[model samples]
Target: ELLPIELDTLVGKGRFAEVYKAKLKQQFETVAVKIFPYEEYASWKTEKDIFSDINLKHENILQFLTAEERKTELGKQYWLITAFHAKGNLQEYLTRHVISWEDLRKLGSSLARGIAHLHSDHTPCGRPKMPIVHRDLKSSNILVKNDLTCCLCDFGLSLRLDPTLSVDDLANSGQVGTARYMAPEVLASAMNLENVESFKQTDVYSMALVLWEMTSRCNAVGEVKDYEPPFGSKVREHPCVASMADNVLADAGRPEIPSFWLNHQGIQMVCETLTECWDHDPEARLTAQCVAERFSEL
Candidate 1:
């Protein structure tokens, strides 16, 4: 049994859970507590399982500490406790500051490495191979650590690409992810839905948008634009599937890259990398590992 604790602040709220900065009475250390409603039990269980995976540990991934089931006056509340990051998520961080080339490289490389780790299935210790596809890969799901590097979080929509599981098993899973970051194939429903590779490619496409977000704010070009979510000018704040498909797929629209990037070698390389990662053809998109290597080179 664990000691009782009081939540200090309501930090974030998502569809399935509410995150708070809390303190444990016994340890007196601040932690993040994600409280899930009983109705969202499935999502809570899925995230817990992903967090508890033996092979999921990585410096660029969010650290999961503990989980508990609490009885509330209305119903049972599921609590997931993890290391608290005071800087909050990447989306919020980008909104407040412009980043240097060094900072951008660190953030981009760490982000790619985290995604690559999730996509990998190698287990040297003979454990079962589990390849995960983070269905939702966006800035909001990425946390900024105190060190300024980024860590991937929010595994509620993640899917384990098991060879044993049939495509029909995930048929009802539906199209899940943020609208603006969705790939062209995903928005158009043109992907081979049964293929796990297709799912992974969609993640890569989303990652490109996140990388673009970071690059847009990089001060290497000597001009920093105001932070804008991908497709901010073309699409509504909360975009719909039809609009995204028409604009991103039909119009072949993408985030604007400033001509100033051409003047900076590092920024130019990053721009080229982003283009390859978000290619309209899923087969042409760079893998997460490949993207990580590109960032490491810069």
Candidate 2:
């Protein structure tokens, strides 16, 4: 039987999972163990599928090592072992490190590259490729390694597409992402279960919002519910989409840029990315691959 991985140092914890720095008994390499909470037992099968489906070699994607069902003193647990990212998540890095423009470029580039890879339609297995929409692509979901390269993490809330699923079926689907970074359509449908297309556009919108937030060095959806802009609410039948577009893109799109990213290549790239991303027509919004390609050019 395989011995237990050497676990130590509680690194991070979310509502359903806890991450720890650990050592693999076989390779003796440092790794990260993400243990799902007992409360999430029912969703374990689905979560396990997503975590297992994603390939590990994308430069911007966290490397998954292995997974095992473990019976601990606390309860039954599913442990997902991944590469240990010494720097932790983007949120932590933004807080602890001095984020220079160069740093932003490196980090952003890595992130976009990872997203591009995930959006690809082909993997080694030759199985019908499914578009992976990272429903929760927030700063916290981006992990940075010791080399300062960034990888998109947290597939717990992500959706894997099947051939039978239509874009509308995907878009108008359920609401599962964090509210703050939700796109206008997503915010509109937050009160009800959305389908597939909603997930796609919402993911697009979330990326656009991310570029803006990173550029401004301020939370875009400040003081709104769950840090989401008031736009997410379908209250009073207000023109939440129009209002949000005006407020964020045109009105808030002034000369003010983050001091760290100002005049930096990353800042310039983000400026262009956000402009296109926050376009009034969601159709014009760039896909994660397009955004990644543009970033690669920079």
Candidate 3:
């Protein structure tokens, strides 16, 4: 699993890992290495396995090159190397500037395609493959490529739907994800354990908010507002599951879609899609593939 690298400049850090701008001289000239602590072994292993899946490859999914365990002065560390995109994540991009409808469609459509690829039960060539649920789908977890397209990233909390997995095994898969973006069923731990499809529906709910995030920052809406997370000031910056459950589950609240956003036909179509995605009933939500197809039409 060991791979030599150069220019390992520290670029960013998160709760579980640090990212560096690195390169594999023999392979890629520009790549990113996400380094994790040895203590978080489960996350590192899970993500590595997911990325290594043959059917997981897609133009909108992050490119996984290699993973390794390295011994350091501090201790042992885990590394996940992937193709580097200079535009960074969607969250950071939205914070910096507003986008036109063209930019919004590129970002939103590419993201949907990535999720659709992950949730697909069969390969593009029609072979069987386990469907994956990206339990942690959010703006920051997606990267913006140089061409202004988006790709899904960060699979630490993702789960593959294996037919052999038992109910007990799924029960242990704890309700883990960002509270603000958590689907109501996820917030209450009420997801249908009997059906794996329940997991995919939850992802659709989260994706709606991300789409909303991108739409909010688009200049096609006449006037654009400053970037703000879903729920805006209704909840705190990092509200816990308790508060979110009260709002999302108890009251069935969702992010507001300003009337102005409906001004453009394309934006209106997107807003309607968001409405369907975040529906309180999990069964009522559209599949990721459906959303991707809709984006293509727009």
Candidate 4:
């Protein structure tokens, strides 16, 4: 009532908050509202502040609507509003739909475009901007638009690299992000923190895994298989960091790309890029913008 709208239903949930599909009474348009307890003010504030950056605007990033603090039925709630996509997150969409080769290119390419924008120090128009590192990048954090392209969302753990911040400022103890999607350097606690670009490379590593997942069920790769997560076979459901560290660091392992899938020339190129993106040495991985260039050429 306060918002002149009704929250339709729980569309998504995370450790940080619950998101609802909402309808705006003022306008015919529907939107998504992420609700957080007042106690998580910092979490809500961080994402809200990130959205405040005008330079962050990109077609592939979730369009921010507004942020509000209100006393509500469930006590004081912190609210974040954004454009709603009925197709839902990549994880959900991938599970329900088998994609064509064109679909794969659209999804993967858009994902790269979104991430590349975040990592760039200058806007598309050449205005200087702070580079951003989406500390958390996973299929669940990526939404599928009605247009069939991907949008990056859930900036709870995202960091903007302001030039003034010292290396110590950017370095934080404990790992953040999904364990299974973590890069080999991340799992091994060997990430290079001295350079700011290292953070961006870690993100690139995560994208590779997501790309691999996308390629898995792509019809272009031959008979589509049921959607399986990266490292689905090697690790148990909900694996921890240590388990991932053991497999990724000690064994020097990565998600398998079958020879049959690579038989196709396009997939061969995609897999080759994935190989570079997940390389054990952080410097060895391809940058997000580089990956986008690769996809555009594909």
Candidate 5:
């Protein structure tokens, strides 16, 4: 069915594409249309690779609505349709509204379900599990849909492991990720060639960091008053944890746990998971599937 797309508003602008909130005449649905700049085809291909290769059906993974070719002032343009996150991102949501403990619990559980779904062997569209890795997992990449379901977006940096080779050897060399959420192993590695398990653990570290942010509304390094070395303090945003360094995590000191987390079951598990995820030894960290089960139990 052909639908008339009307440009409603320019919601976001990135290096490669401009995301616009559009209205579809046929379905009366509001959607986000990512118009890939003519020069950013390579970047767009990165997104395409994940969408075409991985067959996942987790609530957290953003739904790809459709792909469209449109003629504009710049000539023919390729646009991707996705379900728009009415709340935009977690950051924007937190900034505008206060989140209660119960709400936060629900949010954590829902996101865990999404992540766990991706880590499973079940694949959509008759494809096999490709061992997907969301290299960039952070608050900004998370989208809360109209019904409150959270989804993972921005696959520009995501990787798909080759079935025949190990994850470490699948793809490497690109130090792609938000600095704040960088795992201990990633921080320690001079190069990006990490074993498959390490990448999975790194993602766990990032997820734990995000949970901390939800609890404290602060950066993982700790507050500005804390005198902690960049990699020395085991806290988020506190001045104690100054920088994300391998040595800090090696000592099991950085990304310090908040005092309140000690009593909260969800937060406690998250902190414990962080400790393992941030371990200098990647093997000690928990797998994404393990994390999903733990959070589900909470």
Candidate 6:
């Protein structure tokens, strides 16, 4: 058992868990501790299982250290301990600083690689294949490391697809994920509920928005805009589902890619990739691995 110190700094908070910064008494190293309430135990359990998978370990993926259950006066508190990233999340980092073309390539490629890793099915000599989908892929869900590379986190809404199981086993199938980054199919409620490919395609759509955010803040050709969440100007800060559905599905609207981006070669490539990823037809969207390769080439 590891000795724990008091968690003082609140780093992040979500619907199901609250994240705090703490130091391990034994190692004297900083770590992130996510506390889950009793009501969200099921969500915690699902995340724990995904993190504990043998084939899930990757440099681009968030590292899971330990999990413990503690008795508290209010009730039982479940903890998920992981690595501490001083740079915070991608959304917060992009808000404060504009990145250069070099930084942009590093950040964009790393983000794509992380998502590709999650979407891959890995099988060892004797272990079962584990295929996963990040239902909530967004800038806020991605953490920035000291090197400016990104690691994907926040798997509370992730789906582990088992070939043997039916699609009915998926929890919160169609309605999961954020509204602004949601795909047209998701906004229209027209997704084929039984297809796992449908879930993966939605993730690709969200990744496109994240890539757009990065490109907008990149000072590639001396035109860097202040960081703004995708569709920030068109919709409210916290967009409603119905409004987003009307914009994305009814009108086929998407986050704008500035015409100036065409002047810069790197930014132009990024805009092209985003266009393919966020295609109105979900079936026409590029896969996560394909997007990763495109970023690497840029």
The reply for model 1, stretches above 4 Å from the true place, is: 123-128
Displacement of residue 47 (Cα, Å) in model 1 is 0.2
Q: 85 in model 2: Cα distance from truth in Å?
A: 0.2
**What are the per-model C-alpha RMSD values against the true structure?**
1.5, 6.5, 1.5, 1.5, 5.3, 1.9
Report the lDDT tens digits of candidate 3 across residue range 250-273: 988988887877979999999999
* Residue 209 miss distance in model 3 (angstroms): 0.3
Error of 2 at 54 (Å): 6.7
For residues 54-130, what per-residue lDDT tens digits would candidate 6 score against the true structure?
A: 78888888889988888889799888999989899999988998998898899889888887778777542335557
The full ranking of all candidates by lDDT, starting with the best, is: 3, 1, 4, 6, 5, 2
Model 5: lDDT equals 0.65
For candidate 5, lDDT tens digit of each residue in 26-75?
A: 65888898889677777787777666644665567887877766678857
| Cα lDDT listed for each candidate | 0.89, 0.64, 0.89, 0.88, 0.65, 0.85
Off by over 4 Å in 2: 54-56, 123-128, 166-173, 190-198, 216-266
Better candidate number, 4 or 6, judged by TM-score:
4
Error of 2 at 111 (Å): 1.3
Compose the digit string of candidate 4's lDDT tens values, residues 113-220: 999999999988999988999978999899999999999989888888877877677665358888988887777777777777888998998999899989987988
Clashing residue pairs in candidate 3, if any?
A: none
Every model's TM-score: 0.96, 0.76, 0.96, 0.96, 0.79, 0.95
Clashing pairs in 1: none
**Model 6 misses residue 43 by how many Å?**
1.1
Superior candidate under lDDT, 1 versus 5: 1
lDDT of 1 at 27: 50
